[PDB]
Amino acid sequence: MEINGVEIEDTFAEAFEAKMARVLITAASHKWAMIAVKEATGFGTSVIMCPAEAGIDCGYVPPEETPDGRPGVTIMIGHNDEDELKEQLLDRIGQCVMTAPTASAFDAMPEAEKEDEDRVGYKLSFFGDGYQEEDELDGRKVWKIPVVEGEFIVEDSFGITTGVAGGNFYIMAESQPAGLQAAEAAVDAIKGVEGAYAPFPGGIVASASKVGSKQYDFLPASTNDAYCPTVEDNELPEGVKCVYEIVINGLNEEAVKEAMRVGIEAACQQPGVVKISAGNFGGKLGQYEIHLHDLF
Amino acid sequence: MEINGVEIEDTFAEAFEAKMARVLITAASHKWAMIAVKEATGFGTSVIMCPAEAGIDCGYVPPEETPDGRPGVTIMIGHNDEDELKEQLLDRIGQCVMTAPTASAFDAMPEAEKEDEDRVGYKLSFFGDGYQEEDELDGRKVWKIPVVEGEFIVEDSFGITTGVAGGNFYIMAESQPAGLQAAEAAVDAIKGVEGAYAPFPGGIVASASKVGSKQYDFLPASTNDAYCPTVEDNELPEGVKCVYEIVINGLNEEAVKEAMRVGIEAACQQPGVVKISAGNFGGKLGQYEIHLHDLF
Amino acid sequence: MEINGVEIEDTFAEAFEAKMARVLITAASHKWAMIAVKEATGFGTSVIMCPAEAGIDCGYVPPEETPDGRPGVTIMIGHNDEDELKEQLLDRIGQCVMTAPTASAFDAMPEAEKEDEDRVGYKLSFFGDGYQEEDELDGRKVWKIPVVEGEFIVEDSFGITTGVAGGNFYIMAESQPAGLQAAEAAVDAIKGVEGAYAPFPGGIVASASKVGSKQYDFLPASTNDAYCPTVEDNELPEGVKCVYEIVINGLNEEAVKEAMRVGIEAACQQPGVVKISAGNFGGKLGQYEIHLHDLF
Amino acid sequence: MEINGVEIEDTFAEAFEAKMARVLITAASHKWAMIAVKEATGFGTSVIMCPAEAGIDCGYVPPEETPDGRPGVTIMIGHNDEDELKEQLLDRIGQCVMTAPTASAFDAMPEAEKEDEDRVGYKLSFFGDGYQEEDELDGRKVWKIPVVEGEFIVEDSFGITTGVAGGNFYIMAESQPAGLQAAEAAVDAIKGVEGAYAPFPGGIVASASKVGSKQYDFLPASTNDAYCPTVEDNELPEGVKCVYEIVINGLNEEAVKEAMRVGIEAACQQPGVVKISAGNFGGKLGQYEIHLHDLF
């Protein structure tokens, strides 16, 4: 198979189950929403050395579609451990959104996706020291917590689902600039898919790893030397001097497959792309196997 | 004292010692440097519920002033615990900068500030799985760690210093929009001060807290209801309907004093500002007393 | 009538016919599309002393909805004079988009709205000095023009329609900061309305004018002193210390009505707003009257 | 001569004399300063089909270095014709800055560079309709013009100098993505040079042209087909698949020389750059020849 003359390797990305929440952040403006959003979702590329996997889903939610009639942004927070996720929701909303000028936080988990729920807003409400006050807002149960700026509004509870983490593909290109232009076009396409986010910096992984280490028994993971253009022993096609990985997490498998589809199609329009591939673990580790040829 | 008719309260901010690192991130462009910087410095407002206190120091470093001749940005990461700092350096550079497209990481601790150092680059280089190699760049010891993109460059070690955490001032305004416009102007000025950063979202604290809780034995901190304009029995001046706090950390006391001076001056140029104040514990807890009146 | 306690004056905005074009700009990334778009729509607030009224309609068009499969943005350019408009399309696309890295220009004038058209692409194609080549891309007739970067792609012709210019409303607020926070919220809402744009800087008019001058024969327009908070004999209601105007242009009356509706709704959610009004000439100059009360 | 293995052609850039103004724009925040600046400098790449050549010089000016103590940005506006320049200053400030929320405009022409001046603020002051008031701010003669937001502040007069226009170099690269990565790094360096600006979109020219046309006696200029990679009869080096040009205007020859120097060095750090050249007219047309070998 080829898309725009780019070979699509017949292989599969191997994904995993992970717990996920989805939060609507509103603010006085879209600018202040993004300020809160960038803080709340940072230090969140991978659960290996980061405390969560977080990112923006919908970059712009019109005022007339929010509970409070203010501009919004939706983010998603993921972790494989459900208690770790509830902690992360509390810490990230409590110290990155409650503290951010004019920002409010509401649940944006689709009812059809909702399996569990955590009363994060109830928990933060104690910050009001007895002055916090329950209210209803567009049918929603909210807490009004007095803060020095005025009030912080937060929904009582946030829904949790089991989503799909680790959807991926590799872009193989003739050079680093070519691979990066293709990679960013891919991420620009992924922005439009609802219920999916790319947690790595700018959506892009420049240092994909393998499980473990050939040399060091203390390392749980290490550089994927099979795909390192500067490692003399690599398994790369001729004329490939750069590989990028795009990693996608999502509410469900369909959202992750859709993100991968539009990401790959977008990447294949850009010059200097040699091959599209995907990372798996032989079928052994994860719960999902997303075959690239099945996307198209 | 008045600045532009705004009363400056005769009081002082009480600040503390905290361990700090200072990292230069370079990339193929300023855009890509900022991508890595925003990931690396997020989830980083307060050591209370976040893993670190992190922020941007210098938003633009010209290519001719970086060791690799590429565009850069300097960030600071801080923590009261030196061991937590070292762990945060490893995690944040390893998962937010090594993974970011084209980004490299160099030490930017001034030689005169350096008290200690940690070989963070050395510890990361094992990711190369035997293929990592030492090199010298602009007289710096660096590791070239082969990655799917090509190579990740990171300086062998990073300097640590005992800096100053928790310099602060309060902006008391006639309304929330007036308060916020004044607050952002203050942060715009602080951006120009070398060696100082404001770790809260957009530099601004919307939810200033107090130690402990009148109602709840289980809270380490709660809303500062003395300054909550919606709390019937607050201690705000007549006319004051919003308070914001700006929190500043820095390499040393002079950096923090300078940031407070230019922050307060800029805030006082904006309309609807009633009073400037600051927070302390009587001088009984912290290592630094910055008297507002001595700034000007 | 009140919206969130804000009085909506029972009056109407008077709008005019103007010629309008709508252009889709694609590029290697949304970032580079935005680079071209900002240049092409600048110096474009008002036909009084600018060459056109231009702005962004849809800030993000998904790659899979564009003819070339690359990320895009749609903009609109308007003028009351159809011959001026055709010149402005040629100059802005020729100097601002053809020159911009990786940018292509396509027609995005809806078939239903299309009244006339100009072969702007054909006229630009002569830049190829004989090397220009005609092609078809997604059913569209385009020119591929050889340039130093590679090729520039531009559709052969662009639709033109009679749209609606000068839909408006005034936000009357207690202070300049409260007014500006309300006005940006309003513009954030308008961003989401397809076929409407707000040509002034940030969508907001800080210096609303009246026709002619009381003191000067040589002026076509001057400050609207009735609404000037510092003019001792202004017509402002008690408590209003700042007025901002939002001016909206659009493909048709419905897009303008909708933009006014969502803009006013969003402005009224923000604190410190006293009254919404609008400007007219008694119904005796323009082609449209949009009564504010009929919007809700 | 080579820089980082990149061949520097022993040739010259031929530049011209042009009239130039340098304006400082302040606003309530750097955000609002930039909104006014983007509108004021747009539609301004080339005086061939644009009304002027305009661009950002210093993208951030500290509050303490401005006349009013607010965040600022400095822009430069040029034209070959003094009268056209004065008209562009009036129109761009009047329609794009006076109208922009919170924005003021001050002169930023260095004393030593000042040849002539035009009382632009005086001309705009008549907008006040007799309510405008002369004043002094930090030793500057300014006009306070009542507007619906409050007041517009503009300096009475603005200095004019004869600067240098059309300094330039060509980046020849192996691919379009490689060329564009080199080009943006180049412009990132030029940002740091005071008194110079790059008027094309993103600082970069994707469609460099030659004087006249081989085919069409009605074309004043056409594509430079000598450097067109898709033109069979081009004169490009082996392996060059894309050329970009950077055009640099400045207050004086030195400022232009420095921008070319740091831009070329930055470009040469990036992968896939084959050759640096420059464009001239055989010493025929312009007042300045700037030999690339002399920069280094």
The amino acid at residue A206 is A
Looking at B145, B165, B185, which one is the last position of a domain?
B165
Could you tell me if A43 and A120 are in contact, meaning their C-beta atoms sit under 8 angstroms apart?
Answer: no
Answer whether D63 sits within 8 Å of B30, measured CB to CB: no
Q: After which residues is chain B broken (C to N over 2.5 A)?
A: none
Helix axes A82-96, A30-41, angle to 10 degrees: 140
CB pairs under 8 A between A and D: 31
List chain C residues with CB under 8 Å of D147. 206-208, 223, 228
The label of the residue with tokens 């199609």 reads: A265
At residue B62, the 3 state secondary structure works out as: coil
Q: From CA A96, how far away is CA A42, in angstroms rounded? A: 10
Q: From CA B145, how far away is CA B138, in angstroms rounded? A: 18
Q: From CA C16, how far away is CA C164, in angstroms rounded? A: 6
- Same domain for C183 and C79: no
Looking at D142, D165, D188, which one is the last position of a domain?
D165
Could you tell me if C267 and C186 are in contact, meaning their C-beta atoms sit under 8 angstroms apart?
Answer: yes
- Same domain for A135 and A233: no
DSSP symbols for B181-234: HHHHHHHHHHTTSTTEE--SGGGEESS-EEES-SS-TT-SEEE-GGG-TTSTT-
- Same domain for C221 and C120: no
Could you tell me if D253 and D18 are in contact, meaning their C-beta atoms sit under 8 angstroms apart?
Answer: no
Tell me the CA distances in angstroms from C188 to B184, C38, C59, C224, C275, one per residue in order: 19, 17, 11, 26, 19
Q: From CA B151, how far away is CA A295, in angstroms rounded? A: 32
Q: CA of B270, closest CA in chain C: separation in Å?
A: 9
The token duo for A15 is 């994904």
Q: From CA D56, how far away is CA D41, in angstroms rounded? A: 7
List chain A residues with CB under 8 Å of D183. none
Which residues of D fall below an 8 Å CB-CB distance to A? 31, 174-178, 180-181, 270-272
Tell me the CA distances in angstroms from C14 to A230, C166, C204, C258, C292, one per residue in order: 66, 7, 18, 15, 11
- Same domain for C142 and C62: yes
Answer whether D175 sits within 8 Å of A176, measured CB to CB: no
The token duo for D50 is 């644009």
Answer whether D223 sits within 8 Å of C131, measured CB to CB: yes
- Antiparallel, parallel or unpaired: β D2-3 and C242-250: unpaired
- Same domain for B190 and B143: no
Tell me the CA distances in angstroms from C36 to A102, B219, C31, C144, one per residue in order: 32, 52, 9, 18
Answer whether C191 sits within 8 Å of A60, measured CB to CB: yes
Q: Could you tell me where the DSSP H helices lie in chain D?
A: 30-41, 82-96, 120-124, 176-190, 253-267, 292-295
Backbone angles phi, psi at B272, to 5 degrees: 85, 10
Which residues of D fall below an 8 Å CB-CB distance to B? 28-31, 59-60, 62-64, 68-71, 181, 184-185, 188-189, 191-192, 262, 265-266, 269-270
The label of the residue with tokens 């080829």 reads: A2
At residue B132, the 3 state secondary structure works out as: coil
CB atoms inside a 10 Å sphere around CB D226? 14
The token duo for B108 is 């930017």
Q: CA of A185, closest CA in chain B: separation in Å?
A: 14
- Same domain for D295 and D209: yes
The label of the residue with tokens 């794009």 reads: D96
Helix axes C30-41, C82-96, angle to 10 degrees: 140
Phi-psi region of B34 (alpha: psi -120 to 50; beta: other; left: phi over 0): alpha
The amino acid at residue B77 is I
CB pairs under 8 A between A and C: 85
The token duo for C58 is 């849809």
Cα dihedral D224, D227, D230, D234 sign: positive
At residue D39, the 3 state secondary structure works out as: helix
Q: Could you tell me where the DSSP H helices lie in chain C?
A: 30-41, 82-96, 120-125, 176-190, 253-267
Question: Of D30, D174, D175, which to mutate for an interface test with A (greatest number of A Cβ within 10 Å)?
Answer: D175
The amino acid at residue B235 is E
Q: What is the resolution of this structure in A?
A: 1.7
A77 is in which domain, residue-wise? 17-165
Q: CA of B267, closest CA in chain C: separation in Å?
A: 13
Residue from the list B63, B189, B269 with its beta carbon closest to the beta carbon of D188 = B63
CA neighbor of B246 nearest in space, from B197, B198, B192: B198
At residue A276, the 3 state secondary structure works out as: strand
The token duo for B233 is 């029995």
CA end-to-end span of chain A, whole Å? 10
List chain D residues with CB under 8 Å of C131. 223, 225, 228, 230-231
- Same domain for B132 and B80: yes
Q: From CA B17, how far away is CA B78, in angstroms rounded? A: 10
Backbone angles phi, psi at D141, to 5 degrees: -80, 120
Tell me the CA distances in angstroms from D44 to A22, C288, D39, D92, D198, one per residue in order: 43, 34, 10, 11, 10
Could you tell me if B251 and B110 are in contact, meaning their C-beta atoms sit under 8 angstroms apart?
Answer: yes
- Same domain for C280 and C181: yes
Q: CA of D174, closest CA in chain A: separation in Å?
A: 10
- C-alpha C124 chain-centroid distance: 24
Q: From CA B253, how far away is CA D160, in angstroms rounded? A: 43
- Count Cβ neighbours within 10 Å for each residue of D233-250 and write b for 16 or more, e otherwise: ebebeeebbbbbbbbbbb
Answer whether C64 sits within 8 Å of A185, measured CB to CB: no
Answer whether C131 sits within 8 Å of D245, measured CB to CB: no
Q: Residue C9 is part of a domain; what is its CATH number?
A: 3.30.70.520
Cα dihedral A165, A167, A173, A177 sign: negative
Catalogue the E-assigned strands of chain C. 2-3, 6-8, 12-26, 53-61, 72-79, 104-107, 116-118, 133-137, 140-147, 150-155, 158-173, 196-197, 209-211, 221-223, 242-250, 273-277, 288-291
Helix (H) or strand (E) holding B172: strand B158-173
- Same domain for B177 and B123: no
Q: From CA C177, how far away is CA C13, in angstroms rounded? A: 25
Q: Could you tell me where the DSSP H helices lie in chain B?
A: 30-41, 82-96, 120-124, 176-190, 253-268
Q: After which residues is chain D broken (C to N over 2.5 A)?
A: none
The label of the residue with tokens 């950002």 reads: D56
Rounded to a whole number, what is the largest CA-CA distance in chain B? 67
Could you tell me if D23 and C20 are in contact, meaning their C-beta atoms sit under 8 angstroms apart?
Answer: no
Structural domains counted in chain C: 2
| Experimental technique of record | X-ray
The label of the residue with tokens 């002539």 reads: D116
Q: From CA D96, how far away is CA D88, in angstroms rounded? A: 11
Q: CA of A86, closest CA in chain D: separation in Å?
A: 35
Closest-CA residue in chain A for D273?
A: A177
Backbone angles phi, psi at D242, to 5 degrees: -160, 135
Q: How many residues does chain D have?
A: 296
Closest-CA residue in chain C for D244?
A: C149
Closest-CA residue in chain B for D270?
A: B28
Q: In degrees to the nearest 10, what's the CA dihedral of C148, A274, C68, A247?
A: -120
- Nearest-5° Cα angle at A289, A284 to A293: 135
Backbone angles phi, psi at A292, to 5 degrees: -65, -35
Phi-psi region of C112 (alpha: psi -120 to 50; beta: other; left: phi over 0): alpha
Looking at B120, B147, B165, which one is the last position of a domain?
B165
Answer whether D62 sits within 8 Å of B184, measured CB to CB: no
CA neighbor of C177 nearest in space, from A264, D197, B240, D150: D150
Closest-CA residue in chain D for A31?
A: D31
- Same domain for A279 and A236: yes
- Same domain for D121 and D159: yes
Phi-psi region of D139 (alpha: psi -120 to 50; beta: other; left: phi over 0): left
Q: From CA C69, how far away is CA A192, in angstroms rounded? A: 13
The token duo for D172 is 């020849």
The token duo for B96 is 């937010």
Helix (H) or strand (E) holding A36: helix A30-41
Residue from the list A130, A224, A230 with its beta carbon closest to the beta carbon of B150 = A230
Q: From CA A125, how far away is CA B136, in angstroms rounded? A: 53
Tell me the CA distances in angstroms from C53 to C166, C264, D39, one per residue in order: 10, 22, 11
CB atoms inside a 10 Å sphere around CB C126? 18
The token duo for D29 is 């925040």
At residue B259, the 3 state secondary structure works out as: helix
CA neighbor of D126 nearest in space, from D156, D103, D99, D88: D156
- Antiparallel, parallel or unpaired: β C221-223 and C209-211: antiparallel
- Same domain for B158 and B28: yes
Q: From CA A72, how far away is CA A74, in angstroms rounded? A: 7
Residue from the list B31, B63, B191 with its beta carbon closest to the beta carbon of D266 = B63
The label of the residue with tokens 């919220």 reads: C185
CA neighbor of C149 nearest in space, from A245, B255, D224: D224
Residue A237 DSSP one-character state: P
